[PDB]
Amino acid sequence: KMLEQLEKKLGYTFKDKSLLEKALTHVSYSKKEHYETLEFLGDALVNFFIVDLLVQYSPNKREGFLSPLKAYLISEEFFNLLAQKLELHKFIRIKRGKINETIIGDVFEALWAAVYIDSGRDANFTRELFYKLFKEDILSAIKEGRVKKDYKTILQEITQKRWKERPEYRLISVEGPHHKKKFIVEAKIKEYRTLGEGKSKKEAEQRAAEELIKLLEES
Amino acid sequence: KMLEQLEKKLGYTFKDKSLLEKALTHVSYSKKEHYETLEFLGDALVNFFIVDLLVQYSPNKREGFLSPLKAYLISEEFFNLLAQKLELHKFIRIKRGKINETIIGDVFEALWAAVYIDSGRDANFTRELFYKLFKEDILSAIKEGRVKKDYKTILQEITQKRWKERPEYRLISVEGPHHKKKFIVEAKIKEYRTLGEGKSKKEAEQRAAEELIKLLEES
RNA sequence: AAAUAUAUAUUU
RNA sequence: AAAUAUAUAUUU
RNA sequence: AAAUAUAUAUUU
RNA sequence: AAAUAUAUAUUU
Hints:
mainly alpha, homodimer, 219 residues, 9% strand, hydrolase/rna, RNA-binding, Double Stranded RNA Binding Domain
């Protein structure tokens, strides 16, 4: 079977083939054995794998900084960047409707569940096999701070949550001393204020937001 | 210290007695260093410990059915049910305030993140210890449920979730004397059906419900 | 046996 | 709530 | 049983 | 927010 082309990239050789196929095969292809179950488990799994790696390498080890940074790590957006190293989609077995941005990301979770279950439920073995493939990528996504949405959206949701209030944006500067074009706005919430410059009134408001995000992690 | 008593309950003696204490230290007690990042880890950890147990020990391994169970099995109220079996309350230490309901759950998450790490990050181990205790409980919190809904109710949520529609009950006949009669009702959904007998129509429907439930989990 | 009251069961 | 069945107290 | 209320589930 | 159904309660 062409399975071997995946085991090679994965770095593991299944002892129970149907298992591997199951995590790959979609319901539309066979409603009798699809990745619904494995996907469910894989979520909890992969999550742990990542949160663990994160908690262990996060610059600012604080839940106020982790929560948002984890969003991108356990998101289907990232799952594909990780799944692409496997070209998982090629091995998928879907029928009704071509591959979907989230269907693969859902297959990515099913897979690791399949490896986990095939190893005798050896968490340690599996977790390792997982770091051997993406630990580096995750560490990178963490060294940069990759967020799931623009800072402005994040900030808003944060404030509306904590204070049922949206942030305030005020323009402070539209020019420099020698008449150049640079915008300066003060993102503000409650009594917490920050500054942000940008080539645009918007780019300046996304900066000031990013700042008002840190200035709140520890409240 | 006094932790030796907790370690006696857990069945695990820390190498770094500080961890156990860091997990048991609430912000108020010592914002210097408390159970906050450690709980964040155990959050994902404990999540995986159960979702794993759930999947392999659930009557129905369908996402529609697992989702709601795993929802309670990880609630900040089910943890107190677990943690109290170790008096985690008398062991935690907070300065200003009192043991809140959902705070026992935040320290609980951090309690195993402590075992895990001190254990040398042995998920397999940190997982087996967890089962050594909270297995029977989790194994039961799946059958009854948070509210212990009655059979007819359970079936209805099942059918509505999977097919967006409710089942059909209908009386078939009565048996025995005129004072001590017995009813026979048929539970039916789409193309499935079971028969229930009872001293009362509902008693009978109920039984038929818990029979159509099994026949539905064996789909 | 009937009735009032109440409890239990079923029914509406 | 009503009915029917039984039980207990009560009246006849 | 009807109405009402509470909860839960699904739908708009 | 509403509709419908299930469970219980309450009033009748």
